[PDB]
Design a protein around this ligand. Sequence first.
Ligand code: THH
Ligand code: K
Ligand code: K
Ligand code: NA
Length: 286
Amino acid sequence: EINFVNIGERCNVAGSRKFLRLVNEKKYDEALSIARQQVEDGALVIDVNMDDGLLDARTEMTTFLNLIMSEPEIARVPVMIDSSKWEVIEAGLKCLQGKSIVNSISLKEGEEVFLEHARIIKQYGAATVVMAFDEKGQADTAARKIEVCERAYRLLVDKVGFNPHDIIFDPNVLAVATGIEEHNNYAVDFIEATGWIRKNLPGAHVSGGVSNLSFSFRGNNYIREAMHAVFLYHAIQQGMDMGIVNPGSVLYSDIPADTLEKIEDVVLNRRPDAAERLIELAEALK
Ligand SMILES: CN1c2c(O)nc(N)nc2NC[C@@H]1CNc1ccc(C(=O)N[C@@H](CCC(=O)O)C(=O)O)cc1
Ligand SMILES: [K+]
Ligand SMILES: [K+]
Ligand code: NA
């Protein structure tokens, strides 16, 4: 965990009901405290996401980023500009004075669009997350994740002249234990793609949205945090070097052995009734 960058997840209106209310009510001082607390808890990057139908995302993004820059305790770490809308990202870039990180670009809309965005990002001197998503869809399997990332690396480095050290691949952290058997290997697929990327795509980082993994256990916060700790323990060993996380938790070492076995059975897909057994533990705890 010495070489792991924690990206604070909490300034995200779709990911935090509190953050959404604060922004909507214009309590920007309080919203900014959430950023500050994450920096105090070790976050070295702050993810900001204003995408909600109640909000003018672009304007909230520029307001919040400008406010961050006014607060030395927060402006000392980079901001990750998190939007599905390009106009929001570009407002964020124009707005920020220091290096920022785009979250994200992908091949979803085709190669010409990807290249155009990458070129704008490079002109701003920004780093970028690249989602493992191409013209064929979201990369779910390890093979798909590797296919999209290798192609994206090649395009970025060879056609855009993009600095490889400024590329952050997100091979997609997807929920497990969903009741759909086709999802059971999703953490293992991520971990496998992570290993390949760090061995084969020189200089590129690997990150992921860790909290998405545990979506099936909403309302069992211990189980979610235990899942996160287990996933990070195995992903970091393959070279995951960043992650979007709630930086405020449960340590891998502290998980009782029989509980660990159940969490690892799910995360590492070690038996087909793993989800069922973990759901049983989760019900007993609440
Ligand atoms: C989708 N995911 C993601 C990702 O996987 N990869 C990148 N690059 N960027 C992103 N950005 C958005 C997201 C990462 N951020 C997240 C992901 C999940 C949560 C989350 O689980 N929040 C809780 C609600 C917590 C609350 O409201 O108190 C939930 O149960 O929904 C909170 C923030
Ligand atoms: K919340
Ligand atoms: K969480
Ligand atoms: Na909106």
